[PDB]
Amino acid sequence: DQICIGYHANNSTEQVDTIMEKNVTVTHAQDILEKTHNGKLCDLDGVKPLILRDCSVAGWLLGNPMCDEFINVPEWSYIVEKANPVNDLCYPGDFNDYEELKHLLSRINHFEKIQIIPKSSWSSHEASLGVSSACPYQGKSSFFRNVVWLIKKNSTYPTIKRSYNNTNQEDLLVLWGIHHPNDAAEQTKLYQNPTTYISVGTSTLNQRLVPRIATRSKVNGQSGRMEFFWTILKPNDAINFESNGNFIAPEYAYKIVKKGDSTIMKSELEYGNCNTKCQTPMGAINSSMPFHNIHPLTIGECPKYVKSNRLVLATGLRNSP
Amino acid sequence: DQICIGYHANNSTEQVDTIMEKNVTVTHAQDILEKTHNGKLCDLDGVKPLILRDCSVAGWLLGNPMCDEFINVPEWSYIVEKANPVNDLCYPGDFNDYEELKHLLSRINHFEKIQIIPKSSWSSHEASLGVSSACPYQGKSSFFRNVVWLIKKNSTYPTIKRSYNNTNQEDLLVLWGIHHPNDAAEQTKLYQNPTTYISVGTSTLNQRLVPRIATRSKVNGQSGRMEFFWTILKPNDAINFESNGNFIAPEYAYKIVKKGDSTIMKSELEYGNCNTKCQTPMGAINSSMPFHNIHPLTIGECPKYVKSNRLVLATGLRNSP
Amino acid sequence: DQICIGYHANNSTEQVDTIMEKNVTVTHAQDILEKTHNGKLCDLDGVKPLILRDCSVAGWLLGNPMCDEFINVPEWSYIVEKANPVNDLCYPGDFNDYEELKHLLSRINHFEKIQIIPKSSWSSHEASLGVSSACPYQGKSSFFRNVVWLIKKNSTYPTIKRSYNNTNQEDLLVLWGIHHPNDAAEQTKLYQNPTTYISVGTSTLNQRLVPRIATRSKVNGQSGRMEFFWTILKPNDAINFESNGNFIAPEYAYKIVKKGDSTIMKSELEYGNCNTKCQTPMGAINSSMPFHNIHPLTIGECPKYVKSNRLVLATGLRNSP
Amino acid sequence: GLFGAIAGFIEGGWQGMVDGWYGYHHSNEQGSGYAADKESTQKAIDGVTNKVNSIIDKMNTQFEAVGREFNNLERRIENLNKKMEDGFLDVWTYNAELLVLMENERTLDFHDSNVKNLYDKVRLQLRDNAKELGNGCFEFYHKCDNECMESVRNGTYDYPQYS
Amino acid sequence: GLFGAIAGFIEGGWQGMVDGWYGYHHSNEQGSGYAADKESTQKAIDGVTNKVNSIIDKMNTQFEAVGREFNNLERRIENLNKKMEDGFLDVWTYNAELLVLMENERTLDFHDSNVKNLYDKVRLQLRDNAKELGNGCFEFYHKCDNECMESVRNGTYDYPQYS
Amino acid sequence: GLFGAIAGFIEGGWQGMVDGWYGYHHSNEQGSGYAADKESTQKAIDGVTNKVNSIIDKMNTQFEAVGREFNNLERRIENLNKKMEDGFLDVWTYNAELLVLMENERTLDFHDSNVKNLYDKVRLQLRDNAKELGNGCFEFYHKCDNECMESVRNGTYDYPQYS
Ligand SMILES: CC(=O)N[C@@H]1[C@@H](O[C@@H]2O[C@@H](C)[C@@H](O)[C@@H](O)[C@@H]2O)[C@H](O[C@H]2O[C@H](CO)[C@H](O)[C@H](O[C@]3(C(=O)O)C[C@H](O)[C@@H](NC(C)=O)[C@H]([C@H](O)[C@H](O)CO)O3)[C@H]2O)[C@@H](CO)O[C@H]1O
Ligand SMILES: CC(=O)N[C@@H]1[C@@H](O[C@@H]2O[C@@H](C)[C@@H](O)[C@@H](O)[C@@H]2O)[C@H](O[C@H]2O[C@H](CO)[C@H](O)[C@H](O[C@]3(C(=O)O)C[C@H](O)[C@@H](NC(C)=O)[C@H]([C@H](O)[C@H](O)CO)O3)[C@H]2O)[C@@H](CO)O[C@H]1O
Ligand SMILES: CC(=O)N[C@@H]1[C@@H](O[C@@H]2O[C@@H](C)[C@@H](O)[C@@H](O)[C@@H]2O)[C@H](O[C@H]2O[C@H](CO)[C@H](O)[C@H](O[C@]3(C(=O)O)C[C@H](O)[C@@H](NC(C)=O)[C@H]([C@H](O)[C@H](O)CO)O3)[C@H]2O)[C@@H](CO)O[C@H]1O
Ligand SMILES: *[C@@H]1O[C@H](CO)[C@@H](O)[C@H](O)[C@H]1NC(C)=O
Ligand SMILES: *[C@@H]1O[C@H](CO)[C@@H](O)[C@H](O)[C@H]1NC(C)=O
Ligand SMILES: *[C@@H]1O[C@H](CO)[C@@H](O)[C@H](O)[C@H]1NC(C)=O
Ligand SMILES: *[C@@H]1O[C@H](CO)[C@@H](O)[C@H](O)[C@H]1NC(C)=O
Ligand SMILES: *[C@@H]1O[C@H](CO)[C@@H](O)[C@H](O)[C@H]1NC(C)=O
Ligand SMILES: *[C@@H]1O[C@H](CO)[C@@H](O)[C@H](O)[C@H]1NC(C)=O
Ligand SMILES: *[C@H]1O[C@H](CO)[C@@H](O)[C@H](O)[C@H]1NC(C)=O
Ligand SMILES: *[C@H]1O[C@H](CO)[C@@H](O)[C@H](O)[C@H]1NC(C)=O
Ligand SMILES: *[C@H]1O[C@H](CO)[C@@H](O)[C@H](O)[C@H]1NC(C)=O
């Protein structure tokens, strides 16, 4: 008669690595790395992302005519933008502190659009002929819908003095622009005054822009340039514009109703019409794992990203052959 | 008769954590995390900090009349500034490369103030009427004490040409400013000349400032702006000023006698009248521990900061019940 | 009769550290830290570094007369520049976005120089008298060879309008400059026109430079300044220059034929006439070790840098006394 | 393994023992069978559970990448940003993979230790009342019925009775 | 524990032994008492001391945060700066807490090992001249006076004399 | 050491055994000599080799410094850059030095464990057919010739023949 001491074995083929030995077969193990995703861009916590499609952030905010989808957008969980969106600045130019503005959007969940300067209000200037073939809408020449390209009326450009008081109890995103003409003849043709300026003032802002003339390559069939500027106008504070030429006036300014956690995600993917609690530019994640290896940039309640192909913890003991 | 092998037990209730088990009672242990501070801002190594109180670094350096405490300051171990000091730029404006200058102060332990341009020396201009209600001193209108707000004499602002040679064997911090008037009428009222400039030259510096006019919101009861600039003037090098208007001349320039380890600490706390060898914005530290968890930003001979609530090492063995 | 169980000993004196004990003598060990280098700057993978010697990157690229060694340079594995090269900007001034350009060079292995504007081509202006004593060559006054300092012909400076079309299927590095004169009398003496500008345009670039006048300290015997600017001109795109004064025209523009892994190494060392597969600013490395402690900044196939003085792994067992 | 029991002096595990990690196999006139040792098994289950949770919690707070945009003349800070984000990923990846490697090795040795301690526990009860075979088994000098076997499993084996 | 002595085959520690970590308890006709084993204890003291110092020194050189100020249109680099500083704190916090966890576990097992090795040291001297009780004690076949007990503590127990 | 064999109950190593890490020394009427145990030695060689390669591979992917230039009014980002690069060097230096310290300690204990397991392997074969001397040696009751010694080394020692 005898009694023996022994240990469990089973039909498991799960293997784990150690320092001294690799591919050790164990009776039980626990994978802790999430390796899969659905492959789709999804609603986060039920809240739909703002998918700009082929429009850029500039195109949306300036009101490019191709981005008519994105006038008065609903609130978003996060934003999705392509690597090289075609519908950017239709009329060629620059966007001043564009990256700093884009960074500001990471703290923003909803804009509400409001009119600060009415287009009809320009009684001393011409406001309806400020269009270009570079920004076409329905086969006809158009422009960024949120700002007004002002020109002389009856061959005279009188000085503009305009002030807006922010009576909303919100920060306000104001956008405006300056036009850079091709030559001295075009400067006079549009605004007449040879030397022009644009002065913009707030409690903080002390700006004065002058048009820089240069011979430039045609971009979108135009060698003229538009340089766009912005500010955040705090509540109870006023913005003051003065210009004798080349001024792109603000029709609409965005109102920042909600400040929350958001992100501008870079992805070529469209919309899966799904829901998730953790989103990546590759697709959405649904797992209880502590880790994943899909993509570093995620939004929501996510496991931690690692570059590993495999993370398996031994729970059981060395399994016998 | 028998002999037994056994191990120590005692009345200790100290516990330590391990991977497989938490709250294991041990006979001996060693806490390595410093958890306490005195709650006070203290002298470091006997050397008192520069506590600006409600003044900012700009207010101190420009010589704001409320910061009369900080004219000819003694050397400091470190600097203490509040999150939102009220006595900043009394007259509204900007401070150019303010953060880069503040960074320079982290390498500086002592300034000595010296006069480079005497106020009396302005024989061709008016120098004593350059004040404002925005910077009040003893119920009367004053200005930043270190710079002179120059205006026209008998309705004429002649061109200023001034040069200073740095004969000290030290780097020299020179501060000056430009004034931005409200409108064309105020420009003429103050300086008469409609178009004005300020050119500043050194071996390295090649600056030319022009006043930008704009309608601005009232800050501290004034819609005019002052924009302040600085440079480090090396020894044996000269600074050259030329201006026909809007010039805020340097009366005094700071001399950098000592360069050492320092820091600008952000704290609402005042002064404990204590001494320490390790200081935080929360308070001072006195311990032999290798670690602490008070605050990341420290100055002096300090233990290492960690986010832990508890770090206890087992020295003894598992204690019996 | 007896049988014993025992273990290896030997004459080894190699020691290793552990947590509980230091300097434990072991029978076998393995050093994993490379501690040595040859002390020389070497060819990497047979490919010679560009050693600028006493010339800087600016001096080389602008074509400073002392840097005649570096006209039409062969391709380089990496670049070597001193901490304080004497042959920098011979004529005093600034180099605009110099660090961003230097960063661009880390992606560049070969430049090919080409003429875009011929010097003879300036038929309406004087081009051969644009020299200075600050840039001497063979005892005579010279200038940066790659750009032309243009001046008035027969007391007239007519407006310059020049355009170059990039017909090469390469990005092109174009360099140009503006001259800042000492006073209004010198402005007229050189270019006659009191108020002057330089407008530069591409598909992206929209620049307009104006000379800033100031009284400046003599650097290299000159108080005048030259400010240098650059761009990358993409293929099939044109650059447009317009100026009525103070223009430093491009004679030559560099062509970027190869884009590869490169680096600007800071070192006072010269050339060992050796070859290596891993290079540091201290010298070259030849080892199979996984680690080294020579210098953090390396180029090529290198072991990993650590700050350790000693990394030895025990392979054998504790050796007996 | 370090403790010399698993794949050591006990050559292999038991497919026939399904109700535990460690236990006993008896054989006598009445029959044979496997009985899992509940105490040592539960202790092992607790230790490994805590370990997995400990491992998870330590990694729970760790670097998270954020999207930052830079223009064409901000290449240096764009590169700084990339190296910073990549650098932390490598640090945290290394931590994860190393911790798994080291603790996996400790887990296997922990199981080896538990088997050894259980073996010695029995050995120390039986003393010279059974032959130590060298394979994990003890062969009794006395006839050991199922109650006798239960006392060894109990921890209650009465040495003085069978001596 | 891994080595099976502490809270293992030796159920509990001794409140009565104050002059050391490990030692002996004798009982005979003359009396009973605790004697600390100096050698094994001092070795344990050295090992744990070095460990604590080793731990401290490795952490001694580690990231230190610095105050950096950025204006309102430098938010990207302000954020980069924050993530960099926070990231290193998490790395170094994790290192500290993990090292403590892992080395605490090794420290307890080290003590368990020392007790085991001391137990076996005695066992190997006594051989078949005493009964191994299973609880850490050895019961002698011969009467063992205080000198006899001292020889076991000595390492000098003369097996051939009492055989 | 943790397992109590190396510099423990086996006081010292053998200069005379050159063909292996662990083995046997026999002495009888015919002579004496060292024989390396191939199996335990090769297992140790494999374990330590893998460990060194594992260690190297984990460090293989790690932070690399890059040269970045900043002008005189970019001191904040120059400083940020320096701290970032220095910070990662300290993290990776610490990792390297700690890993070496911890794994060196495990390597020595691994060797100690292998000797112990080899010792017990023999002990379990011989059982009560030899005297356990307490020093790593077993003294036989029967005369043990070179074939008899070979069977102990074999794992084939026939206990029933010499019992
Ligand atoms: C061969 C020729 O001389 N054709 C002129 C044409 O000018 C040229 O032809 C065009 C088609 C290109 O091939 C160019 O080489 C050259 O410009 C005349 O006008 C065109 O060119 C001007 C620039 O010189 C403008 O590009 C203009 O387009 C608009 C536009 O953006 O769509 C028309 C629009 O109504 C204008 N809007 C406003 C508010 O002014 C703008 C604006 O003036 C500029 O964008 C500001 O820079 O320009 C082209 O139509 C045309 C009519 O003028 O006659 C051809 O015979
Ligand atoms: C109702 C009215 O017209 N009152 C004028 C007053 O101007 C107005 O009243 C002030 C109190 C505010 O309500 C404003 O809306 C309005 O300007 C006249 O001057 C005052 O206003 C000017 C701006 O236009 C200045 O703000 C001035 O203050 C000082 C100052 O900073 O304290 C006076 C000081 O002596 C001046 N110092 C120098 C060196 O020039 C400065 C300086 O000119 C400006 O700050 C430059 O931007 O202004 C107010 O006193 C006054 C006297 O002119 O008459 C009332 O009847
Ligand atoms: C005492 C006196 O009046 N001497 C003049 C000298 O001017 C002065 O002496 C020189 C040697 C220095 O001590 C200066 O303090 C002072 O200017 C006359 O010209 C020299 O000075 C001028 C500046 O005013 C220039 O510096 C000039 O040098 C060059 C140069 O760079 O080498 C000559 C060169 O041919 C010029 N090139 C072009 C394309 O114009 C440049 C250029 O005009 C400036 O660099 C632009 O900023 O200047 C010195 O020769 C001389 C002759 O004019 O006569 C002495 O009597
Ligand atoms: C371990 O297994 C993997 C996947 O099955 C295999 O690719 C790898 O080569 C194996 N490694 C070793 C060391 O056997
Ligand atoms: C408008 O702005 C001014 C500041 O310019 C503020 O004091 C005032 O309360 C605001 N509201 C109205 C209704 O005018
Ligand atoms: C350990 O102790 C702490 C505080 O004394 C307690 O809050 C915690 O729940 C305990 N942890 C476990 C796992 O029992
Ligand atoms: C003044 O500065 C000049 C440079 O402009 C320098 O060469 C000179 O030595 C300095 N010293 C005196 C006493 O002027
Ligand atoms: C270990 O050896 C080094 C170099 O020989 C010596 O300097 C050091 O003091 C020794 N360390 C200890 C703890 O004995
Ligand atoms: C020159 O550049 C223009 C753009 O200005 C481009 O369209 C053209 O194809 C280029 N080639 C030639 C030969 O001019
Ligand atoms: C264990 O088993 C025996 C029968 O073999 C029984 O009589 C005894 O009470 C049991 N003791 C315990 C502690 O379970
Ligand atoms: C130890 O004790 C014995 C008495 O029991 C004594 O005779 C002997 O000399 C001692 N030996 C040592 C090494 O302490
Ligand atoms: C071991 O040695 C014996 C002689 O002592 C021999 O008969 C036997 O075949 C050998 N067995 C093995 C496995 O080598």
TrEMBL record, chains A, B, C:
Location(s) in or outside the cell: Host apical cell membrane; Virion membrane
Membrane topology per record: Single-pass type I membrane protein
GO MF terms held by the record: host cell surface receptor binding
Entry keyword annotation includes Transmembrane: yes
Disulfide bonds: C42-C274, C55-C67, C90-C135, C278-C302
GO cellular component, one term: viral envelope
Glycosylation: residue positions: N11, N23, N154, N165, N286
GO biological process, any: fusion of virus membrane with host plasma membrane
Record keywords, A-Z: Clathrin- and caveolin-independent endocytosis of virus by host, Clathrin-mediated endocytosis of virus by host, Coiled coil, Disulfide bond, Fusion of virus membrane with host endosomal membrane, Fusion of virus membrane with host membrane, Glycoprotein, Hemagglutinin, Host cell membrane, Host membrane, Host-virus interaction, Lipoprotein, Membrane, Palmitate, Transmembrane, Transmembrane helix, Viral attachment to host cell, Viral envelope protein, Viral penetration into host cytoplasm, Virion, Virus endocytosis by host, Virus entry into host cell
Protein family membership: Belongs to the influenza viruses hemagglutinin family.
Subunit structure: Homotrimer of disulfide-linked HA1-HA2.
Function: Binds to sialic acid-containing receptors on the cell surface, bringing about the attachment of the virus particle to the cell. This attachment induces virion internalization of about two third of the virus particles through clathrin-dependent endocytosis and about one third through a clathrin- and caveolin-independent pathway. Plays a major role in the determination of host range restriction and virulence. Class I viral fusion protein.
Protein name as catalogued: Hemagglutinin
Protein's gene: HA
Parent-protein residues present: 17 to 337 of 565
